[PDB]
Design a binder for this molecule. Structure first.
Ligand SMILES: [Zn+2]
Length: 46
């Protein structure tokens, strides 16, 4: 089996793009700078 839904608790600093949260703002402020910029392979003649 797998444990879960055991007691509520939602950190104040959480990311929307993903389901990853953090306790320290510094961690988020920096993390947020991950869902932007570098893009995955796309155009061949680009
Ligand atoms: Zn994120």
């Amino acid at each position: 089996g797998s444990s879960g839904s055991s007691g509520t608790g939602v950190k104040p600093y959480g990311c929307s793009q993903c389901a990853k949260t953090f306790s320290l703002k510094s961690q988020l402020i920096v993390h947020q700078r991950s869902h932007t910029g570098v893009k995955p392979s796309g155009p061949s003649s680009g």
